[PDB]
Design a protein around this ligand. Structure first.
Ligand SMILES: *[C@@H]1O[C@H](CO)[C@@H](O)[C@H](O)[C@H]1NC(C)=O
Ligand SMILES: *[C@@H]1O[C@H](CO)[C@@H](O)[C@H](O)[C@H]1NC(C)=O
Ligand SMILES: *[C@@H]1O[C@H](CO)[C@@H](O)[C@H](O)[C@H]1NC(C)=O
Ligand SMILES: *[C@@H]1O[C@H](CO)[C@@H](O)[C@H](O)[C@H]1NC(C)=O
Ligand SMILES: *[C@@H]1O[C@H](CO)[C@@H](O)[C@H](O)[C@H]1NC(C)=O
Ligand SMILES: *[C@@H]1O[C@H](CO)[C@@H](O)[C@H](O)[C@H]1NC(C)=O
Ligand SMILES: *[C@@H]1O[C@H](CO)[C@@H](O)[C@H](O)[C@H]1NC(C)=O
Ligand SMILES: *[C@@H]1O[C@H](CO)[C@@H](O)[C@H](O)[C@H]1NC(C)=O
Ligand SMILES: *[C@@H]1O[C@H](CO)[C@@H](O)[C@H](O)[C@H]1NC(C)=O
Lengths: 152, 299, 152, 152, 299, 299
């Protein structure tokens, strides 16, 4: 069955790699076809074109830390004609508004972030989907952390 | 990692047909089931202490549909034995999946004491000959069978996705209770078997998860950089066998090395002059997702 | 006018069905064409192919409940070749961090969740977009709760 | 290089226009091609068709205001055959749950909102991506505020 | 549910041209407006107590653009009466929408005391004959008219989307103040009108929202399962009328049954031998989004 | 706004080759670097007080790769001087970008004391003649060169995106420390240079950011509304020059007007009879993203 012929990829987070965000394509409903490669944890575009890029991460924390914690999710492009990470999509989220567990209780918190947009890419471009606090990464369920692209 | 299901009915000496089922995660026995002749149904004889079957939603229910398979396989074996040119001692249903380094897949085939018979294809939703010989369209092997719909669902479903989902639950519950991962040592040697020109031998030493796959690729394809790029395409010098790499039936020269939990492998290749770059050995294993190894002459 | 020829669908939540999340296509800017069917509250794919699947729900609550409340949104696939809900996309959100109305006031809270990704689907597959707390579903405005797919 | 031939656009927020949300296409990884126009701060579709529309805004606030503050993001369509804003996609978010800085401290808060879906559009339709509190718009980084459409 | 707007100017006895407007949600009068001859503009004569027009942003302003329509329709009626072969007592602008079960749509057409005249098409942005007879290109009926731009906007806009949005506001404010939904009883009978071979009669008994639509589909198309699948295509044995189902002008044998708020319908069909599966009756109503009903001979 | 980088090596009188580099934001000098003959490397002679180079991640490192360019350009100049029909006093590398109103772009070309030589195209990843004359494929101008890879990276990269990103950092740090934006006054005059039929003159008076671009478009293309629509296509009566508008080498009649920070421009056009609508002047500047201006005869 022809996935379609269009370069595409939908990689998901590896739960067996605690503390970090490693993407894999060897799972249930994941994709890595028609040329796009997963190299050094980055997706590599196989041809000139317009691409839909997206990603979602789910942060989870038990009770609240100190001062203030910031969660950032961002998709970068390192172009073949300009080898430097330049942000394409990015968001920030503040889970614990300094609440900090008074001393009794402190329930868990969940904070998801979605990113997505269309971009002109060169053959050879490298796309990265990174976060700043991989220690809060909740990849316990399944479709909670993903990163993908489809050539439109 | 590996998840393998083995269902087997045998004609035994003279009389009844015995039935057994084995559930193996890597080289760890998880479940054993055998057909009770007194009761006329299966019984779980063994269950690994670390496997809570309730935490594995994708492991088939009804004790792996044992009664269903035992019965349908018994029927299939009887039919197979009518044409005296096929008569066999036993019949086996081999199905499971694997995540060997970067490689991953699932399988489901039926073999006989005489050798591989038919392989089930998820795409065509039917069995396909594994040998030139062909296979008798009887029992669980033909769409003609009244229970075909169940075969498609139990075997096809598991192979289509069920297994790949289940294997992850086993991994979770196995984490601490089995041999730890162990990275192998690799060396490629360029010996020479006299009559032929050159011979390459890739040897992988003492690695834990016993599943290992090897790919021989002409070095030209690595355009100077010896790293196997995940989504990249590579022509690969296929091996010759009725089995496809990944299926437990594929011939890999693996032996559990001396008093230890680890295993060792030796893969040889006939460096015929047909090529034009001298293959390089690419090793797929849990440790080192996929590494490339070179040199001949003897390195 | 040819919507395009591509199987597509953008269904929205029925506001006239309080307490539950029922999808309809008989509204203003909604879609259900070229083969995809809305059956038993699920979208049904008409052909093999790569599909962009997405959904958004908007939760709303007056003041805060007790202990802790979890909001989940998830899109499942029940494949023709494996009749079982398997999650493709999913997210969790914790509105009331146990704050619970002290006893005076308690303003309302809004919490949206977006889900989206590309997937390989078989002719006959059923897609579901479900939530766990339909009693918090805010479908008062309009484009606040939707579920759709487009064949790429 | 042919962007593709498909009408497309990915505009981003102008940081040099404090207090408001003005879209531009004259930047790094932005787009405005094959017919779509950016007129009066709205994207204008050049042809009949199915379009993927999306947008993201990032709100940021220092400490907490009074009573309660509501943040809304919404994409409207003003059709050629019905000149009136009708909402296609919309979401609401409540940052400060009335917490209001007790009197000592008050950390900053970040709240992102994503919107996206597929729609049937007429040649000449005008799409708007607006917010209610532009004074909380955080367009300091880069790919934090965007609006785009691609003809599928 | 249903939303219908009716604008009508009449030549009345001898003299002036009278004008009225009716806004109906289902069978509930919401607004009545009539042209005041003393003042020379319209006046709201009736307004349902449950309808707060401020909560219905999509209901046309300026008392439904009454003065605009009255005047332009008066002009159109005068022109129509010049060709003595068209002379009519009155002119009506029928526009509105519906959400009958799964079915939904909008309409906007002009009818005469003599019958349907022209239908406005959202796509072409112009009027189209509803009868072979054709329609006089005068008044509000031609692009030639100086006010055409307003027609496109007021009529075209409402029909394109305005109405479908507004109907939802009416529904909200009507929730508790009108007859409750009532599910009908259906039975299909296979009588026989003598001269012809077979006749099918679908009868729907006492349903509330008065809008009901019926589709006759050959049973073969249901491939064994008698459920109407939403997005699925179905050939449907169309009826013959100048009106399209959905437009209030479509002939449905509906009568408000005995002292009650409910209604009843009877739809007959000529089972000519042209077919090859015997139609089944599919009923579209608010209660039961869309149900299929069978049997003939008399069930 | 504008960001321009100018690298220049000269043969000076007799002997050594001098090298200088200038970084200009708008008309503001940001950095000056010159080759130190004693030390044999570049030195920063000037640095604007408002520019913190650490806050501009996209401004090239190693003092704008000065030593690299000086050396490679020196090599290129020597080769160019061997064919005595090319011999030149100096060589310059002009690269940078702009955001003039709605217009925006980047450039990178090499000019000689004799005039423009070659332009670097981001697409083809190579240089292209700027004159019919062609250009000698030597030094930094040919793929043959051992350092070509660095040229592609430093020049190509900056032109591909580096510059457009950097210019924004300059703008931030310049905000308060440079001439404030100043909106011009425009007037189009329809004089007549005697021999030819008509002549149009667009004059823009005292605007600050010195970058201004003008487009002459036949009025027919504005279909009655005189507003330049961003993404809309417009045929535009191109000017004739070896340079493309945007490159600092394009001939614009700009002069810094009397004691002030502002500038003035005068653009003339030969209203030949080839057209059929009489052009209208479209002015692109930071203030007024893009405005249209009309009238001839003398307005
Ligand atoms: C299945 O089990 C039988 C008996 O236990 C064994 O002989 C056979 O080799 C097994 N098949 C495979 C390929 O695991
Ligand atoms: C697995 O066994 C545990 C006891 O170790 C039991 O509590 C649990 O309910 C079983 N399965 C699960 C996790 O539901
Ligand atoms: C099975 O037996 C039949 C005889 O009934 C024989 O013709 C056939 O060749 C046998 N199967 C094969 C193809 O070996
Ligand atoms: C419109 O109203 C007029 C006058 O009240 C009436 O005679 C006519 O039948 C109505 N038409 C429809 C379809 O409601
Ligand atoms: C409808 O009537 C209410 C009084 O019942 C009035 O206060 C309101 O302004 C009107 N519409 C609304 C709800 O704004
Ligand atoms: C309208 O009147 C004219 C007479 O001027 C007649 O010829 C025409 O046929 C009439 N309309 C139609 C086509 O019936
Ligand atoms: C570049 O610098 C040289 C030497 O200072 C100068 O003469 C020349 O005009 C400059 N070129 C440009 C295009 O600015
Ligand atoms: C730029 O200079 C400032 C002071 O002028 C210094 O504190 C800063 O570290 C430099 N760049 C930055 C902001 O990192
Ligand atoms: C360069 O010199 C050669 C002879 O050395 C001459 O033929 C050529 O015309 C010169 N360059 C050009 C092509 O103008």
């Amino acid at each position: 069955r022809t996935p379609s012929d269009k370069p595409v990829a939908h990689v998901v987070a590896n739960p067996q790699a605690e503390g970090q965000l490693q993407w894999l394509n060897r799972r249930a409903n994941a994709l890595l076809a028609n040329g796009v490669e997963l190299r050094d944890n980055q997706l590599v575009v196989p041809s000139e074109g317009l691409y839909l890029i997206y990603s979602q991460v789910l942060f989870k924390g038990q009770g609240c830390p100190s001062t203030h914690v910031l969660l950032t999710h961002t998709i970068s492009r390192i172009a073949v004609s300009y080898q430097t990470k330049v942000n394409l999509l990015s968001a920030i989220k503040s889970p614990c508004q300094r609440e900090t567990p008074e001393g009794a209780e402190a329930k868990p918190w969940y904070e998801p972030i979605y990113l997505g947009g269309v971009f002109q890419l060169e053959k050879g471009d490298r796309l990265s989907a990174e976060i700043n606090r991989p220690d809060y990464l909740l990849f316990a369920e399944s479709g909670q952390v993903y990163f993908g692209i489809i050539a439109l | 990692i590996t998840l393998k299901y083995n269902y087997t009915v045998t004609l035994k000496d003279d009389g009844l047909y015995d039935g057994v089922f084995y559930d193996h995660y890597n080289d760890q026995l998880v479940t054993k089931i055998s057909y009770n002749h007194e009761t006329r149904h299966g019984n779980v004889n063994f269950r690994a202490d670390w496997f809570n079957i309730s935490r594995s939603p994708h492991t088939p229910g009804n004790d792996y549909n044992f009664n269903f398979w035992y019965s349908l396989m018994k029927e299939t074996l009887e039919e197979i034995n009518k044409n005296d040119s096929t008569k066999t001692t036993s019949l086996s249903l081999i199905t499971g999946c694997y995540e060997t380094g970067l490689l991953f897949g699932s399988y489901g085939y039926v073999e006989t004491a005489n050798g591989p018979l038919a392989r089930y294809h998820t795409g065509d939703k039917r069995f396909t000959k594994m040998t030139h010989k062909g296979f008798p369209k009887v029992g669980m092997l033909t769409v003609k069978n009244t229970l075909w719909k169940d075969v498609k669902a139990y075997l096809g479903g598991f192979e289509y996705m069920g297994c790949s989902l289940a294997i992850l639950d086993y991994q979770k519950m196995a984490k601490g209770k089995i041999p730890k991962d162990t990275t192998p040592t690799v060396k490629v040697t360029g010996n020479e078997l006299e009559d032929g020109n050159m011979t390459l031998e890739c040897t992988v030493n003492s690695f834990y998860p016993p599943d290992v796959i090897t790919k021989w690729i002409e070095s030209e394809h690595f355009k100077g950089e010896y790293k196997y790029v995940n989504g990249r395409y590579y022509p690969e010098w296929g091996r010759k066998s009725n089995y496809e790499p990944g299926e437990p039936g594929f011939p890999w020269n693996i032996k559990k090395d001396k008093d230890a939990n680890t295993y060792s492998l030796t893969d040889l290749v006939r460096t015929t002059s047909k090529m034009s770059s001298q293959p390089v050995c690419v090793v797929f294993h849990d440790t080192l997702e996929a590494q490339v190894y070179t040199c001949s002459e003897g390195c």
